[PDB]
Ligand binder design. Sequence first.
Ligand SMILES: CCCCCCCC/C=C/CCCCCCCC(=O)OC[C@H](COP(=O)(O)OCCN)OC(=O)CCCCCCC/C=C/CCCCCCCC
Ligand SMILES: CCCCCCCC/C=C/CCCCCCCC(=O)OC[C@H](COP(=O)(O)OCCN)OC(=O)CCCCCCC/C=C/CCCCCCCC
Ligand SMILES: CCCCCCCC/C=C/CCCCCCCC(=O)OC[C@H](COP(=O)(O)OCCN)OC(=O)CCCCCCC/C=C/CCCCCCCC
Ligand SMILES: CCCCCCCC/C=C\CCCCCCCC(=O)OC[C@H](COP(=O)(O)OCCN)OC(=O)CCCCCCC/C=C/CCCCCCCC
Ligand SMILES: CCCCCCCC/C=C\CCCCCCCC(=O)OC[C@H](COP(=O)(O)OCCN)OC(=O)CCCCCCC/C=C/CCCCCCCC
Ligand SMILES: CCCCCCCC/C=C\CCCCCCCC(=O)OC[C@H](COP(=O)(O)OCCN)OC(=O)CCCCCCC/C=C/CCCCCCCC
Ligand SMILES: CCCCCCCC/C=C\CCCCCCCC(=O)O[C@H](COC(=O)CCCCCCC/C=C/CCCCCCCC)COP(=O)(O)OCCN
Ligand SMILES: CCCCCCCC/C=C\CCCCCCCC(=O)O[C@H](COC(=O)CCCCCCC/C=C/CCCCCCCC)COP(=O)(O)OCCN
Ligand SMILES: CCCCCCCC/C=C\CCCCCCCC(=O)O[C@H](COC(=O)CCCCCCC/C=C/CCCCCCCC)COP(=O)(O)OCCN
Ligand SMILES: CC(C)CCC[C@@H](C)[C@H]1CC[C@H]2[C@@H]3CC=C4C[C@@H](O)CC[C@]4(C)[C@H]3CC[C@]12C
Ligand SMILES: CC(C)CCC[C@@H](C)[C@H]1CC[C@H]2[C@@H]3CC=C4C[C@@H](O)CC[C@]4(C)[C@H]3CC[C@]12C
Ligand SMILES: CC(C)CCC[C@@H](C)[C@H]1CC[C@H]2[C@@H]3CC=C4C[C@@H](O)CC[C@]4(C)[C@H]3CC[C@]12C
Ligand SMILES: CC(C)CCC[C@@H](C)[C@H]1CC[C@H]2[C@@H]3CC=C4C[C@@H](O)CC[C@]4(C)[C@H]3CC[C@]12C
Ligand SMILES: *C\C=C(C)/C=C/C=C(C)/C=C/C1=C(C)CCCC1(C)C
Ligand SMILES: *C\C=C(C)/C=C/C=C(C)/C=C/C1=C(C)CCCC1(C)C
Ligand SMILES: *C\C=C(C)/C=C/C=C(C)/C=C/C1=C(C)CCCC1(C)C
Lengths: 240, 240, 240
Amino acid sequence: INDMDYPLLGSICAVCCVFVAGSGIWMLYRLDLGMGYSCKPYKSGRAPEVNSLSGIICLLCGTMYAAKSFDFFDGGGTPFSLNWYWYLDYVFTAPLLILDFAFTLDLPHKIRYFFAVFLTLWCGVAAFVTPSAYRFAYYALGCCWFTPFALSLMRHVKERYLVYPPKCQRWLFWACVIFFGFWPMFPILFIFSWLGTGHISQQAFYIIHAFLDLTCKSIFGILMTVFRLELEEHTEVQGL
Amino acid sequence: INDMDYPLLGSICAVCCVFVAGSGIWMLYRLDLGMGYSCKPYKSGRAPEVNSLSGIICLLCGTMYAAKSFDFFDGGGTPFSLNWYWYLDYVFTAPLLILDFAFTLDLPHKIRYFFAVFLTLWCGVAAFVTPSAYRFAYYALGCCWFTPFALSLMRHVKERYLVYPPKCQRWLFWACVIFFGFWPMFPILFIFSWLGTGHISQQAFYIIHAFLDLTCKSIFGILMTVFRLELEEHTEVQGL
Amino acid sequence: INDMDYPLLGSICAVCCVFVAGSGIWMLYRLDLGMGYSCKPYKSGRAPEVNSLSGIICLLCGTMYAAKSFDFFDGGGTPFSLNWYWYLDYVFTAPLLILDFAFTLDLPHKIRYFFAVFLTLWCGVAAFVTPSAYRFAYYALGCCWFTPFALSLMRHVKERYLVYPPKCQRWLFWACVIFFGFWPMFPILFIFSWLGTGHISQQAFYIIHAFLDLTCKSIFGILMTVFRLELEEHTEVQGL
Ligand SMILES: CCCCCCCC/C=C/CCCCCCCC(=O)OC[C@H](COP(=O)(O)OCCN)OC(=O)CCCCCCC/C=C/CCCCCCCC
Ligand SMILES: CCCCCCCC/C=C/CCCCCCCC(=O)OC[C@H](COP(=O)(O)OCCN)OC(=O)CCCCCCC/C=C/CCCCCCCC
Ligand SMILES: CCCCCCCC/C=C/CCCCCCCC(=O)OC[C@H](COP(=O)(O)OCCN)OC(=O)CCCCCCC/C=C/CCCCCCCC
Ligand SMILES: CCCCCCCC/C=C\CCCCCCCC(=O)OC[C@H](COP(=O)(O)OCCN)OC(=O)CCCCCCC/C=C/CCCCCCCC
Ligand SMILES: CCCCCCCC/C=C\CCCCCCCC(=O)OC[C@H](COP(=O)(O)OCCN)OC(=O)CCCCCCC/C=C/CCCCCCCC
Ligand SMILES: CCCCCCCC/C=C\CCCCCCCC(=O)OC[C@H](COP(=O)(O)OCCN)OC(=O)CCCCCCC/C=C/CCCCCCCC
Ligand SMILES: CCCCCCCC/C=C\CCCCCCCC(=O)O[C@H](COC(=O)CCCCCCC/C=C/CCCCCCCC)COP(=O)(O)OCCN
Ligand SMILES: CCCCCCCC/C=C\CCCCCCCC(=O)O[C@H](COC(=O)CCCCCCC/C=C/CCCCCCCC)COP(=O)(O)OCCN
Ligand SMILES: CCCCCCCC/C=C\CCCCCCCC(=O)O[C@H](COC(=O)CCCCCCC/C=C/CCCCCCCC)COP(=O)(O)OCCN
Ligand SMILES: CC(C)CCC[C@@H](C)[C@H]1CC[C@H]2[C@@H]3CC=C4C[C@@H](O)CC[C@]4(C)[C@H]3CC[C@]12C
Ligand SMILES: CC(C)CCC[C@@H](C)[C@H]1CC[C@H]2[C@@H]3CC=C4C[C@@H](O)CC[C@]4(C)[C@H]3CC[C@]12C
Ligand SMILES: CC(C)CCC[C@@H](C)[C@H]1CC[C@H]2[C@@H]3CC=C4C[C@@H](O)CC[C@]4(C)[C@H]3CC[C@]12C
Ligand SMILES: CC(C)CCC[C@@H](C)[C@H]1CC[C@H]2[C@@H]3CC=C4C[C@@H](O)CC[C@]4(C)[C@H]3CC[C@]12C
Ligand SMILES: *C\C=C(C)/C=C/C=C(C)/C=C/C1=C(C)CCCC1(C)C
Ligand SMILES: *C\C=C(C)/C=C/C=C(C)/C=C/C1=C(C)CCCC1(C)C
Ligand SMILES: *C\C=C(C)/C=C/C=C(C)/C=C/C1=C(C)CCCC1(C)C
């Protein structure tokens, strides 16, 4: 229903777009500055390609949020909305997050996790354009794709967490809190939204998801950058 | 025309979705169990990333068929159909099949084959939403992309078939029968469907394509897994 | 407005489709013929995978232009148009061009350039389906993604241009003229088109963009092939 506070939504999207993009520019700037937590001009001179994935997602999320803000400023309903089809932008970003996490931790089965999230979001996308009882059918299919992905990622994370130093474990623990404390919240909001239970209104749904992207995209990326800085120095500069 | 036996279509799609997904879960389970046909815990401990492509496609095809079954149970015409736009799901799966086949056989020019199938399917997708004489124009363009792909894949397969042991050649021969015995059947069904000649009705078109996916996705994957098991043991455990 | 000379557009698209595809088939044929500018059957026998990206784009662009010609022959407005949504085909091709350029010159930060062009085009796609003042908002966002990509590519190109031999520098200089002489023309045409200033009519817009694809896709690819031939021989056969 076209009765929500659209200018508030645009302002919220504009504010987070600046925050996510600014964080992404920092980590990209920080990455090429030096390998270790202090500084290192690289042995070969150039940073690894996969290490920049965290920064690009924030800019990708920032660009996605910039388009969202333009949609809300125009009152919504624009031909290029990125808000009419929910989770559609997340299809481009969320699979890259776990891919970045896999590369950072060297977790095997990266391609399996990649398609797990990619198909998990796609089932979620199909689970609201269907105004029938099968809306939860796609929701169930997504959970069937996410639960064995939520699991088997806790295994590998838990197995490798005991190897890293406590200094590196610090951020890694916080990243896992971001990982396994806020990603499972996305299905819960879907149940309680107007699509399911109805506790969350449409206006609140955009706002809370706007707030549940700095932690998932920006702050999680920031932790990954710092954790990489601790990882890089400890492994290379500290030689451990 | 909305007069076909939709509940039959949903039941057929549901049955094959269970079969394709179950086969995919097996080969993923079988892969991490052990390298050789018997068992091997890997030298490095982790399976190669590209070896899991066969399993993911079946789950990808199973998830795609699960969405098809939901569409047919709801009587069709759902906003997220995956049946209104034919071959659209195949765009996500078919290029990965040859990519898996290329990696299994180490066939060069993988990227060329990948884009060959990717553009071949896309031309097929555009060749039914066009209710005019240009429907066959996109069909001709797809064949122009597929015939030099159907060829030059027979070359490389034939050249390498003489190298493998007869034990491995067994499955490889059967895979090539699946490869070069059923993929060329997709264009033929298009000609004889209501889009072209009209011999095949709309109801029969979904059913036969539902039956022509276990062989292409599941059974072909199963052969690839067993052929890999024979390849892996013969090369590593048997040292040949 | 449906008043432009559609058969002229189809003829122009058909002519360039033959030219782009024919050039792509040549460079693919030339690549496997031999490494050096003269001939070399490869040390391992097979060409590098990334070296074929230039040829595939031309065939990809040729196939895309073949679909454009079919759309214009049918009078336009076909369900599968590739002309109703501008720059949508460029999303599939343009990111691969810089990726090929990055691999040819071994320029680092390939993934950063890839997403830069990928998001630059996407902002352009959203910048005409929006019939409001926010059409230039997406345009500004695209320029914000392209200007730091147009820059930092001049740096790396300029830094490495002094290393190559003058024989190789010749084509590289011409490629950079194609690169940094015609890519910035795409935003300029958008400003002066009926979407912006209005100097360029709709009929002229397709024609000039049809002419501004041989240089970007075919001729640029041809230069890349010859530059690779000079690079390959000089580095391998000439041992320099
Ligand atoms: C900007 C950086 C982005 C980076 C990455 C982008 C990748 C993600 C791709 C996003 C796809 C966007 C699809 C959005 C479609 C929105 C449809 C929509 O809003 O419809 C509702 C709206 C009804 O609302 P009103 O008329 O206001 O009703 C109130 C009565 N006065 O309908 C319309 O406005 C009609 C829509 C016009 C056609 C839609 C065109 C969508 C743009 C196409 C480009 C995307 C390409 C997708 C590829 C496949 C080709 C379809
Ligand atoms: C689930 C796992 C999937 C994994 C991988 C997925 C990748 C493949 C992507 C699939 C894209 C799906 C597009 C399907 C569109 C279907 C359109 C359709 O059915 O229209 C017909 C139907 C007419 O039928 P009835 O009204 O019953 O007529 C009888 C009269 N009583 O029309 C409708 O229902 C209207 C359709 C509503 C809008 C369609 C929204 C499609 C969903 C968008 C999400 C997909 C994103 C695509 C990206 C580009 C953005 C467009
Ligand atoms: C061929 C090789 C291609 C290789 C790579 C391809 C990748 C790029 C994908 C291209 C997506 C194509 C989308 C084009 C949509 C065009 C819509 C259009 O033309 O609408 C205008 C036109 C109005 O014109 P007329 O009725 O003539 O008006 C005058 C009055 N007599 O409207 C129509 O014709 C209705 C359109 C029917 C539905 C459109 C179906 C588009 C085809 C879907 C396949 C693409 C899949 C996209 C994935 C997401 C799923 C949506
Ligand atoms: C037709 C219906 C739709 C078809 C598909 C529906 C869902 C498919 C089920 C899951 C598909 C694959 C999940 C992808 C992400 C998980 C990644 C993965 O499997 O990694 C492999 C990993 C094993 O790796 P190893 O090599 O032992 O690790 C040591 C490191 N060397 O697999 C596992 O951990 C086993 C699978 C997950 C374990 C969790 C156990 C409990 C799962 C809850 C069940 C939920 C319902 C799903 C039903 C089927 C589940 C198998
Ligand atoms: C504007 C119109 C649309 C534009 C494009 C239309 C179709 C384009 C034509 C084909 C494009 C490329 C096909 C992609 C899949 C084929 C892969 C490929 O070319 O592999 C290279 C491979 C050569 O590899 P070598 O290195 O010798 O192998 C030894 C291993 N070291 O190429 C070939 O085998 C030659 C091409 C295929 C051989 C088949 C011969 C007969 C083909 C039937 C012609 C059908 C019409 C198509 C017209 C143009 C065809 C060239
Ligand atoms: C919410 C709004 C939307 C969010 C995002 C909007 C645009 C984001 C800004 C740019 C994002 C990244 C651009 C991607 C392509 C550029 C590739 C890149 O950054 O390469 C790194 C490269 C540094 O590499 P080194 O390792 O030093 O090179 C030596 C080789 N070893 O970065 C740079 O060169 C610095 C950035 C570009 C330099 C150009 C300086 C002037 C730029 C004009 C500003 C235009 C406005 C954009 C605002 C923010 C720009 C930072
Ligand atoms: C519940 C409140 C939530 C508040 C929202 C969060 C606001 C952002 C602030 C940071 C959030 C995450 C930070 C994670 C922890 C890292 C901080 C830190 O201490 O990092 C250092 C160093 O690493 C860093 O520098 C990381 C911190 C830099 C973060 C910069 C903030 C994001 C950048 C955005 C700038 C542009 C934003 C535009 C303006 C916003 C307009 C709305 C690591 O070492 P220490 O443990 O201090 O040990 C000291 C000896 N080594
Ligand atoms: C014309 C009739 C078609 C029937 C449809 C096919 C039904 C599926 C049965 C298998 C089809 C393909 C099998 C390919 C041949 C492999 C069988 C085989 O023998 O494999 C072994 C070992 O490899 C295997 O174990 C592969 C076979 C396992 C296949 C399991 C079937 C698919 C899994 C689906 C389970 C879940 C399905 C859900 C229920 C369905 C509800 C509708 C290889 O060694 P042998 O030659 O026996 O040599 C012995 C000494 N080494
Ligand atoms: C302003 C006028 C623009 C005209 C449009 C362009 C027409 C195409 C002609 C070539 C354009 C770019 C060529 C770039 C320069 C390379 C030419 C060249 O000399 O290459 C050689 C060798 O490399 C080549 O062979 C590259 C040239 C081959 C290009 C073939 C033209 C494109 C192929 C299309 C064929 C099918 C087209 C279908 C018909 C069209 C119907 C409309 C490199 O060595 P040289 O400097 O001669 O030194 C000699 C000792 N080594
Ligand atoms: C309320 C929400 C946000 C947070 C609740 C999630 C908490 C309880 C979860 C998130 C991440 C999880 C941690 C992930 C990794 C490890 C490392 C392992 O070696 C011991 C368990 C431990 C330490 C987990 C304990 C539980 C944990 C801390
Ligand atoms: C009716 C349909 C399903 C099957 C017809 C396809 C048969 C005839 C095709 C499919 C795969 C083909 C095989 C593919 C590979 C080889 C290996 C080569 O060294 C000799 C030829 C040989 C053995 C081919 C013979 C023809 C073949 C068996
Ligand atoms: C109805 C149409 C579209 C397809 C149905 C035919 C499929 C399901 C059938 C036809 C002939 C069958 C093949 C016949 C014999 C064997 C030998 C066995 O050791 C492996 C499977 C394999 C290779 C079968 C796979 C399934 C198969 C290909
Ligand atoms: C009118 C349009 C088409 C062409 C104008 C663009 C010209 C002026 C641009 C395009 C490519 C550019 C070149 C790109 C690379 C180098 C190598 C460097 O070591 C010196 C500068 C030099 C030589 C640049 C000079 C300016 C240049 C030649
Ligand atoms: C914005 C970025 C992230 C990582 C978003 C992630 C979202 C989820 C993992 C959502 C999952 C869903 C599942 C499990 C099944 C039902 C539908 C959802 C889309 C909510
Ligand atoms: C489900 C998986 C597979 C591998 C499907 C493959 C389909 C084809 C190769 C279809 C090809 C077509 C071509 C050659 C040109 C006309 C249109 C078709 C889509 C039928
Ligand atoms: C056909 C191939 C190429 C490489 C096309 C490239 C097009 C551009 C770089 C277009 C860029 C745009 C930007 C900078 C922002 C506004 C919108 C444009 C799409 C014109």
